[PDB]
Amino acid sequence: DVDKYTRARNAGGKRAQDCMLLAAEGDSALSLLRTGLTLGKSNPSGPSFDFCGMISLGTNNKVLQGIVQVLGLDFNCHYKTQEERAKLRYGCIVACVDQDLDGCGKILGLLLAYFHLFWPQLIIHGFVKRLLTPLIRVYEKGKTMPVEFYYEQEFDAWAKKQTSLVNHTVKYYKGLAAHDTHEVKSMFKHFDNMVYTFTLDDSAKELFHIYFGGESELRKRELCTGVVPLTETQTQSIHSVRRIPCSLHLQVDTKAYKLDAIERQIPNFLDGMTRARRKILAGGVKCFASNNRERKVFQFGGYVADHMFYHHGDMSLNTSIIKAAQYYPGSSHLYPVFIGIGSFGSRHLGGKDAGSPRYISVQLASEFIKTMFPAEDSWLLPYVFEDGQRAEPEYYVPVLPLAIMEYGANPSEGWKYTTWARQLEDILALVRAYVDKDNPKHELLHYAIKHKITILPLRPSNYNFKGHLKRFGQYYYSYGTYDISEQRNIITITELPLRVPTVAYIESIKKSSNRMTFIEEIIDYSSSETIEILVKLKPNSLNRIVEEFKETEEQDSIENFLRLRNCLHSHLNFVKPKGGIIEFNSYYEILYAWLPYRRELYQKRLMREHAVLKLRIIMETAIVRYINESAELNLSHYEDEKEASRILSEHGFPPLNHTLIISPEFASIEELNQKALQGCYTYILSLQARELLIAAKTRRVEKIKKMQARLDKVEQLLQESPFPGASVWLEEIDAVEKAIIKGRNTQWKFH
Amino acid sequence: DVDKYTRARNAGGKRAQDCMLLAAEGDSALSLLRTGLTLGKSNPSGPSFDFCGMISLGTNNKVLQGIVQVLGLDFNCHYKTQEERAKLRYGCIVACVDQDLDGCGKILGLLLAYFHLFWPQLIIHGFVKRLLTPLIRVYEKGKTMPVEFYYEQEFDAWAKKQTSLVNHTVKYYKGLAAHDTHEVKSMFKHFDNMVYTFTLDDSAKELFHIYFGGESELRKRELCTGVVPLTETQTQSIHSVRRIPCSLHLQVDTKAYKLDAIERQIPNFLDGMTRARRKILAGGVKCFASNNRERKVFQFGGYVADHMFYHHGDMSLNTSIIKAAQYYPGSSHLYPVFIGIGSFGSRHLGGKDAGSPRYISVQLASEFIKTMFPAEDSWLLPYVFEDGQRAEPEYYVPVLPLAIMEYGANPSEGWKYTTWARQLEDILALVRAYVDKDNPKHELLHYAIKHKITILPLRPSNYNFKGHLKRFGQYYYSYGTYDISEQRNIITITELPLRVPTVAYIESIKKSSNRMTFIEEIIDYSSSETIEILVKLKPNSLNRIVEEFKETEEQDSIENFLRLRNCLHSHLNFVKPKGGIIEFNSYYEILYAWLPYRRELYQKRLMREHAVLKLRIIMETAIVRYINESAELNLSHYEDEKEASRILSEHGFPPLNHTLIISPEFASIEELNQKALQGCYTYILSLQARELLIAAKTRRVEKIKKMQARLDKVEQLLQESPFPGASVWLEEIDAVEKAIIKGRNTQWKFH
């Protein structure tokens, strides 16, 4: 009487120990198992419904009770003896789960933890097993049998010794549903050698406690370093004899699931955005690069999912896109990525009153984005590859540290992550002092970096805030403003605390029975982006209010009667670039850690530009040479490109990689050098007729002069006193500041 | 004490009749109203929270009770006198809703119906009003004031008398959230003249009954003709004095909402697909046109939303994409649009056991789609324009009628539309008889079309069905198969009825108490795409079953004890091309109606091909002429394109529209003629250097000969005995049949 349970024919009988129970993650996995278990004559030696059943994974848990019932497990008894283990209705249980994060690692980790908590001996004696399907298959043209890898590292090692992947197709199978019909048949042909047994080692005892249940502050230490992939020796030992240590599964598969959940809520300290928000920014740059023509939010959401591999659903995608374009006092973005065209929400509902994505249009803030996130060094960043395809970068390195300049909050599902934006002027002073060698505090600040002296101040931003920011002890408090009307017995609230929604604030007063004894009517006549709230007092309650809140030094009676004060508690917990959690004591430490990344990115931006510019000078010089000699190198008298290319070679024209020189993209300098000069003469054969005109040639000649002048400039930029590219960094800070000032003069509309 | 209610300052007082209550559709609309009502000094004469309140639209309805409470309405009293109407707390109620289908038409239609049912006099005396915001604004470069239209007909009339729209930007505001900050201020500057009053006329009484309540069978006749837009005279009368008749609102706004809901679940009879599925097919053709490289379902879903204006959410989009690629016995698609790579579901769960769109990849069935939906006549179809941008076509006209060859369910109401796929051989015989003049039944069939004689048979498809299709009376029945094991008292079900899921079938037997008295265990050992179910009988129940189901002549005792019979009930209700619902008595009537559309599409396909081919011959001849004279017309000795174009003109080279001739796109013959010969010389100036080679010229010269030969062929095709393009239609049927046969030899994998 167990739902989605297909019993084996021999289950519970004399051959019960020969039977295996397949635990599938869901209905799709069950369909795959049913296909494999019913191959019949096509797979004579493979498993069938003889000695093999299926159960769906879907003490109080109902699905776990079904597994116990079908297996005949008893909680009190310890299966320390073979005779006792023979009482079970199945020989073993095999988990068939996806090889993704919400697969093995969470579903399989819980299953291992459940067995480890109650029946540790079953894991010791090999009762719990796992189905390890291939993760990557490489298909080559002309070959029907692919090369299959069970780990990412194995494919990487194999790809190193290939020197060519143009004729190889690489497909990722991170879920059971990804396997095609012919692949399912192949796996069940060798079903025996893809069943792996779990072993309980000494390290698994504490690891199970850390990742499942128990006290915190021990799981936190684990999640502060990142995931270490299994080495080649470890994988080979797993493959040599098909036994997977429980510790190895927990510290790779389960930790990666834990880190992924955190990375969805806590941003990287380099750019101050999460992976979901980084996909939107990366997708936003691509979508609006050609033309900054406004798109509907749902239309742009489709672009991000199609290009940036966003698979978490449009509900979260549209919400995150809308939040990226909201601009109001108290919004999470002081400098929104997008320009909001329509009603994107107000401070009164905390941004929850945004319009529908169907009618709401979005547009990239081109002036701010192109200066804060330069496109030149976006090729130089490390990138995330999802199923072998390039996705949003691992992190951005903006001109100014966005993790410091914005407002960030997160629900208490892990580290708290509260961030309060610092002043733009304070941030500019610190960065300019670090970069400008003529700054009076340049030497002082550099010496302070290595000694943590924080010579310059970082203060909370008070932009779009008509209140007071006061510091008492070690905390800042934001105060609202109010007006008292003695004649008509009205207290008018003209400003709320820094990030307090209006509607939620009204409910806070209304749910306070003590304060409602002095008031009878609250009317919210506030405009958009401005607070003006009518509080109707009782006829003689104004004097009673003063004597009930005592007017402490930090908070006035009205500021106590009306909750017009809040503490700016900051929890500076971020995600490291290589993975893990880093905790910062102060806002300066975040800025100090971001400085080396931006400093080194400028250095490697000029090195690549120097290499690219040198190649482009060679190519444009050859093109100009052809235009002058095109009349007497009249290619119309030659049969085809092969003959034309031979003629060009005999005249000394250099063979070049046309596409690589035009668009180097994500090419390293050493990769660029070994491929640029090894090409063809397409850069000549693809020249249009309009390019041979006198004016067209003259513009090309002038372009060569500019590159040669720019080439000498780049060499000077590399030999700079503070560090290479320091002057480039300084002028880009000014450009960012002008964009921010222009965006603040408007309502982040820019036109 | 009403939620989301902002009372006016003068509401309920002496100036209560001067106050107006704004009823907003949602929170986003409320934010827009708050912005407008609090402009203050910027809008001195505009409305403020004086004499104006806001209420949210969200007897038993809680939201309607709030409106009654704030307005002080009494159900029993009839507001036939001015003195009685003065008791209301507000002078009037104004509905602020989106100008889309799920705006005015549904929310506003229900509000009008609610007032009409209880207080008809309020509508008569003008208590119920509407805020009519601009629907379309046209912005011209250099002008800050746009041209605003409240109806799409007004914009169409205005666009007719415009020379060009190259310097005009057209934006659609179908929701209140679409209005930008500067547009909201402009609307509230003239708030008075955008408030329209509803009037109750004689025709509104039955229209309110038809569209709201009143059982049915009277609304069906209304929804069988399509929406008639308001004429110019009607709109001008509405604008002259701002009064909107209730009948006009119901017959346009409310009716369009009703038709849109039906069109989301009932397909068009020309292509047998709904608007949502047509977007996926149209998006699928675009996405996989360049390369049929497989993409994840969520990735492809993003493409459809971004390009085909699919705004109904990824939950329905991913489900519809998966259904379009499912191929199993009993699936809705006998000829799926896509190739399913992965686990897309099985017959056991009725396709509900599909894999997650994250791990599931999709690919276009290029061979079948390119033949069933030719790309050459997809330019000629009428197209849907959403917010002024081209979307999926209004309908497709395939080579064979897809509305007849597939299975339709319509699970949720909607005229109980149901279709059972007809035999492919029968359909081919009918269409070939109509098209082939040498067919023995060609003359007989043509006589039958105008007399409804249905000489040829149309039988239900039995493909992928190991059962029996029997006809008793006027209905077909599908029978499953079973095997009885006398020795072990086991009944084995080897086949189910036509579209009966396995899991749901098992529950049907288990929920039958009388049937469960004869059995104790049902085991589903069935493979994928094959039924094999173990039914364990009671030790002495085989004989009792025979005597308890009476052995009907039509239905066997076991076929009665086990529900192995189902009736193929079909309700052939479809959507007309121009809108509305058409009811078909038989399957051949649907084929007869589809024939003229496919016949005329071939005629206009050859007309446009004849025009395009004539232009391309001129352009290629000029290009070939230039290549021969390129050495003598050495353009390298001229300054710019302007000088080069002048030289080309002096040599007799014709000016041509390069882009239009190469890619005519959605251009009519008359539009093509007036624009093709009016252009620049880019077709010469954009020629690459590789095009001047001897082999390149020779291929171009041979291409001209093929077009000239093809031009004479097209002229012969237009003068054909049955009708123009009959032979083209005949040979395209063969191509479709080969694609279908090839797709059936594989599992619709084509590999």
Automatic annotation (TrEMBL), chains A, B:
Q: Which cofactor does it need?
A: Mn(2+); Mg(2+); Ca(2+)
**Record's GO cellular component terms:** host cell cytoplasm
The UniProt entry lists the main location of this chain as: host cell
Reaction(s) catalysed (UniProt annotation): ATP-dependent breakage, passage and rejoining of double-stranded DNA
Q: Where is this gene product found?
A: Host cytoplasm
> What EC class is this?
isomerase
Q: Which UniProt keywords apply?
A: ATP-binding, DNA-binding, Host cytoplasm, Isomerase, Magnesium, Metal-binding, Nucleotide-binding, Topoisomerase
Any one GO molecular function term: DNA topoisomerase type II (double strand cut, ATP-hydrolyzing) activity
Q: Which GO terms describe its biological process?
A: DNA topological change; sister chromatid segregation
Q: List, from the UniProt record, the residues annotated as the active site of this protein.
A: Y359
Ranges of residues in domain Topo IIA-type catalytic = 266-733
Instruction: Sum up the protein's function in the record's words.
Output: Type II topoisomerase. Processively relaxes supercoiled DNA. Displays DNA-supercoiling activity only when associated with the viral histone-like protein.
Q: Which family does it belong to?
A: Belongs to the type II topoisomerase family.
Name by which UniProt lists this protein = DNA topoisomerase 2
Native organism is African swine fever virus (ASFV)
Q: What is the lineage of its organism?
A: Viruses, Varidnaviria, Bamfordvirae, Nucleocytoviricota, Pokkesviricetes
According to the record, which residues of the full protein are present here? 414 to 1192 of 1192
